[PDB]
mmCIF file of N, CA and C and ligand atoms in Angstrom:
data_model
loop_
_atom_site.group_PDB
_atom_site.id
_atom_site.type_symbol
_atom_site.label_atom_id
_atom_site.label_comp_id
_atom_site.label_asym_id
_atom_site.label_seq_id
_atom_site.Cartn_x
_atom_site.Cartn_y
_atom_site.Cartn_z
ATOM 1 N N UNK X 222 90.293 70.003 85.763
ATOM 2 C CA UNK X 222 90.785 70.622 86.979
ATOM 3 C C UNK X 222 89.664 71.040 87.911
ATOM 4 N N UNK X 223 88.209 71.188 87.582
ATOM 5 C CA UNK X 223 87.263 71.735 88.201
ATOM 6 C C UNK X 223 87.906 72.953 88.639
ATOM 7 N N UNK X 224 87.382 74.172 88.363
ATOM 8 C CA UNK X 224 87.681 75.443 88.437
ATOM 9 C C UNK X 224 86.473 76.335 88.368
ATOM 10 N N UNK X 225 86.551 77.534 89.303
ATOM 11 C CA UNK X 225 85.929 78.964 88.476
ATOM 12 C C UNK X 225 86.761 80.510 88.636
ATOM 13 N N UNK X 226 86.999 80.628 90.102
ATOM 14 C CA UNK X 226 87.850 81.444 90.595
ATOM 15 C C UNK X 226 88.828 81.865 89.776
ATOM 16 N N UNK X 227 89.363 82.725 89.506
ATOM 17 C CA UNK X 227 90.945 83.060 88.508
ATOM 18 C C UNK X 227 91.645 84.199 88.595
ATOM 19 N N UNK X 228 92.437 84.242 89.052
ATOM 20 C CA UNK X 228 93.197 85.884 89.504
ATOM 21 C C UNK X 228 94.607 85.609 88.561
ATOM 22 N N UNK X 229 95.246 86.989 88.778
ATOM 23 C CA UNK X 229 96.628 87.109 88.470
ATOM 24 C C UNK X 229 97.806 87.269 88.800
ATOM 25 N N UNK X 230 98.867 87.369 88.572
ATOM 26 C CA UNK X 230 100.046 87.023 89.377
ATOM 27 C C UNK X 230 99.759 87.642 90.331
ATOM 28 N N UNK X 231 100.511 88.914 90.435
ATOM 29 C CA UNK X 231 100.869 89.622 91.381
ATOM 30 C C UNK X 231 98.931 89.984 92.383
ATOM 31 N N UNK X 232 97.692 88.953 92.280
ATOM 32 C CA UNK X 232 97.142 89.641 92.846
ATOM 33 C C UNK X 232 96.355 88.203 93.777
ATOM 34 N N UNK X 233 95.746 88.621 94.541
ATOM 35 C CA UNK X 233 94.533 87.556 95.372
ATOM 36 C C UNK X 233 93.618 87.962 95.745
ATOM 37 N N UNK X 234 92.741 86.735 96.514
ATOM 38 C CA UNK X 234 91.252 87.204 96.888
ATOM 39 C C UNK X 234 91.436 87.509 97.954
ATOM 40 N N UNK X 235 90.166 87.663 98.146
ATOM 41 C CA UNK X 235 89.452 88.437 99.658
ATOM 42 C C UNK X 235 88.595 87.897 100.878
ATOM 43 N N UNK X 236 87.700 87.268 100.187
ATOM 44 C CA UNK X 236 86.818 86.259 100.866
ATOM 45 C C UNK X 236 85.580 85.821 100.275
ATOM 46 N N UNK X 237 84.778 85.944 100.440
ATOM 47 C CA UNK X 237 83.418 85.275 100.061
ATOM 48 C C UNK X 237 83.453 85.442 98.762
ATOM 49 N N UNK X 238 83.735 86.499 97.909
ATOM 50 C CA UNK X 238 82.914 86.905 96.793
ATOM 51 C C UNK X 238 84.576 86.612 95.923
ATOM 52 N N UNK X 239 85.757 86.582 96.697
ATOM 53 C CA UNK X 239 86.860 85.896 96.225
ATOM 54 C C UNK X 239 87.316 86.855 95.324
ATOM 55 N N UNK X 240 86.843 88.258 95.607
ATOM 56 C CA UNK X 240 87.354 89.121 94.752
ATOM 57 C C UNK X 240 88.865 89.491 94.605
ATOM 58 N N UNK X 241 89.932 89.240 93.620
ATOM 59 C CA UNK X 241 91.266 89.398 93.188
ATOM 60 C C UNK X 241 91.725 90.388 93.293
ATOM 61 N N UNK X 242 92.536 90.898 94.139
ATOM 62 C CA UNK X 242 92.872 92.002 93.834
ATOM 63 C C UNK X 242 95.078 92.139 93.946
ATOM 64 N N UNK X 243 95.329 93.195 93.908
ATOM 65 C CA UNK X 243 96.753 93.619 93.469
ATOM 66 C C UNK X 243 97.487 93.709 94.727
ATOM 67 N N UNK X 244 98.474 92.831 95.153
ATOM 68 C CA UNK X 244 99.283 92.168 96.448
ATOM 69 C C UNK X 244 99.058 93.879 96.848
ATOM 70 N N UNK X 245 99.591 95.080 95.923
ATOM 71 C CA UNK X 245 99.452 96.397 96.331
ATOM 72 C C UNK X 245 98.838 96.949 97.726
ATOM 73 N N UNK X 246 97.286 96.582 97.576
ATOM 74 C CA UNK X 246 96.536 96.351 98.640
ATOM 75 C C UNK X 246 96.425 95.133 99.681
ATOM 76 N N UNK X 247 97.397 94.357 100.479
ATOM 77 C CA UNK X 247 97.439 93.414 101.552
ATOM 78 C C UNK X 247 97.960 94.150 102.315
ATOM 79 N N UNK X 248 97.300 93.455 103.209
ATOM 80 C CA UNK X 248 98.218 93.997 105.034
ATOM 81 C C UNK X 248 98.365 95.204 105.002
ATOM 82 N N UNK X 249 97.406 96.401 104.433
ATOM 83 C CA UNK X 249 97.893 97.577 104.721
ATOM 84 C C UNK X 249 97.164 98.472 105.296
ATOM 85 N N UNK X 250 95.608 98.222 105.260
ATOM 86 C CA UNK X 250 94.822 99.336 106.380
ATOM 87 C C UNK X 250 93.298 99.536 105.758
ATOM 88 N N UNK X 251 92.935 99.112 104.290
ATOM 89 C CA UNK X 251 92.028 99.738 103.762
ATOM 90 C C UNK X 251 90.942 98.262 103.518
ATOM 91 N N UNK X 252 89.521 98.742 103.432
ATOM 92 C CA UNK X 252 88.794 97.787 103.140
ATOM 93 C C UNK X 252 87.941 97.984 101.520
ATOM 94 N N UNK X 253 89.258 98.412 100.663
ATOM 95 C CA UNK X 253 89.095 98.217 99.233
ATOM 96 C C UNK X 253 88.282 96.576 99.087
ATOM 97 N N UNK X 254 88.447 95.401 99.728
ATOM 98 C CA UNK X 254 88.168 94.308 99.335
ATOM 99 C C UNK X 254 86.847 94.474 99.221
ATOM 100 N N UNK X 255 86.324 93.132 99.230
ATOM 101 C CA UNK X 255 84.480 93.000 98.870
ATOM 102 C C UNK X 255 84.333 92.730 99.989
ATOM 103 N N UNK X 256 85.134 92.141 100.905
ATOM 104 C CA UNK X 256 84.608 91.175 102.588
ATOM 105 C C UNK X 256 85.359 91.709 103.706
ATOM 106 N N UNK X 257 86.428 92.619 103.142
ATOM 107 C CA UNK X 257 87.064 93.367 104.173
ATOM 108 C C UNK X 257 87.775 92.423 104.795
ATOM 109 N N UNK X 258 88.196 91.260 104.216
ATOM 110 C CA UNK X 258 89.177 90.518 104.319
ATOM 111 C C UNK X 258 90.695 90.979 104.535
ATOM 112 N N UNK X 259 91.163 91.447 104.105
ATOM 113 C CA UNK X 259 92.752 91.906 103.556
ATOM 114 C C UNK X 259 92.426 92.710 105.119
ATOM 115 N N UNK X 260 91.692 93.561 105.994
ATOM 116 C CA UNK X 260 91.693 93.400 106.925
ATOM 117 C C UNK X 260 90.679 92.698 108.323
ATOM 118 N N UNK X 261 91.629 91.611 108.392
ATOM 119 C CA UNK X 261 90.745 90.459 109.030
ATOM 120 C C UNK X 261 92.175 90.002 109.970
ATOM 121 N N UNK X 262 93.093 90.952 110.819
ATOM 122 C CA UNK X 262 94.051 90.139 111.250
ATOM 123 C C UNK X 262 95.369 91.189 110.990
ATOM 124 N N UNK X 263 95.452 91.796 109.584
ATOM 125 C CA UNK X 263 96.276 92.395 109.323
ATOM 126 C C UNK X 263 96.358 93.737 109.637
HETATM 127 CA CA1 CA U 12 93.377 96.756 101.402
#
């Protein structure tokens, strides 16, 4: 499959560093991520 990345259900990345985290934190205001992705739009 060529792989490295790997998260879990209920969670996704962020950006660069592709850090996984818990749907909990999307679209909601905080830059818990590593790239401050989750706010990039949202
Ligand atoms: Ca967040």
């Amino acid at each position: 499959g060529s792989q490295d990345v790997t998260c879990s259900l209920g969670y996704f990345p962020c950006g660069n560093i592709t850090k996984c985290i818990p749907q909990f934190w999307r679209c909601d205001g905080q830059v818990d991520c590593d790239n401050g992705s989750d706010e990039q739009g949202c």
